[PDB]
Design a binder for this molecule. Structure first.
Ligand SMILES: Nc1nccc(-c2ccc3noc(-c4ccc(Cl)cc4)c3c2)n1
Length: 273
């Protein structure tokens, strides 16, 4: 069964990660998103416990699926002759960080702190499940406007977490660390901190710091907006050229700027309602 239980609707996103349609589960009228991936486009394949070989995106999502609402929930998947169809939970109302920032420009530090903290918590979840997202950017973050909860979406470029070096990378370039641009090698957690550093800067300045590879490998951070003397520190720390000089997830959340974060609902009332 496939066409029988879901009611396909409009086209949401597209389309290098695949095509996402807005759908609803006929079973309970639950809002869902239906994502299609063409088999020809799939680069990473992973085996399941059933031995059956599926897209890596499915394996990752299955590992990070649970009661935690910080990462998107994979509800079900189907195989088709030429494509795979992923059923994912859909927030409503919902808007991705990119549009949210594009509308409202630079977020104020109180809001940026609430969001960034949630992202940190979500990414920590993936690592604890052996998953590395590898494409952490504003576009891949959803905002549950009512609950003030951010959801991490799209593991199409992700991979199983390992402590050995990564030599492949298919995520966003402007978010990728210098050691990828300059050596095509990196370690998961180190690189993830760099991307979060871009994300944090993107929230507080309304845009990303680095445009070209030259700016990335140099790693000099200029602030175009008034940013707290302390947020700048954390931002420059995540963007430390030397990966070892970068914070750990423990260090980032212990960083002083990250203290006294709003609860999700508070954030929604103060900044979203
Ligand atoms: N590309 C991708 N990969 C994994 C999950 C999703 C996903 C899942 C649920 C969603 N609900 O809403 C959206 C959405 C809404 C508006 C825009 Cl402009 C973009 C995405 C989802 C995306 N998309």
């Amino acid at each position: 069964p496939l066409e029988s239980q879901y009611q396909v609707g409009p086209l949401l996103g597209s389309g290098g990660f695949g095509s996402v349609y807005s759908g609803i589960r006929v079973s309970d009228n639950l809002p869902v998103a239906i994502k299609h991936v063409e088999k020809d486009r799939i680069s990473d394949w992973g085996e399941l416990p059933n031995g059956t070989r599926v897209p890596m995106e499915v394996v990752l999502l299955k590992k990070v699926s649970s009661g935690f609402s910080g990462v998107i929930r994979l509800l079900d998947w189907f195989e088709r002759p030429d494509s795979f169809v992923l059923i994912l939970e859909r927030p409503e109302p919902v808007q991705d960080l990119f549009d949210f920032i594009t509308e409202r420009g630079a977020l104020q530090e109180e809001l940026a702190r609430s969001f960034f903290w949630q992202v940190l918590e979500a990414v920590r979840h993936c690592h604890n499940c052996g998953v590395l997202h590898r494409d952490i950017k504003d576009e891949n973050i959803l905002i549950d406007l009512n609950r003030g909860e951010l959801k991490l979406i799209d593991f199409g470029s992700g991979a199983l977490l390992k402590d050995t070096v990564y030599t492949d990378f298919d995520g966003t370039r402007v978010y990728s660390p210098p050691e990828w641009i300059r050596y095509h090698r990196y370690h998961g957690r180190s690189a993830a901190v760099w991307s979060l550093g871009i994300l944090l800067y993107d929230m507080v300045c309304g845009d990303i710091p680095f445009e070209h590879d030259e700016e990335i490998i140099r790693g000099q951070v200029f602030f175009r907006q008034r940013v707290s003397s302390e947020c700048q520190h954390l931002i420059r720390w995540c963007l430390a050229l030397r990966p070892s000089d970068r914070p750990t997830f423990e260090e980032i959340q212990n960083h002083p700027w990250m203290q006294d974060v709003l609860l999700p609902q508070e954030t929604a009332e103060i900044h979203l309602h």
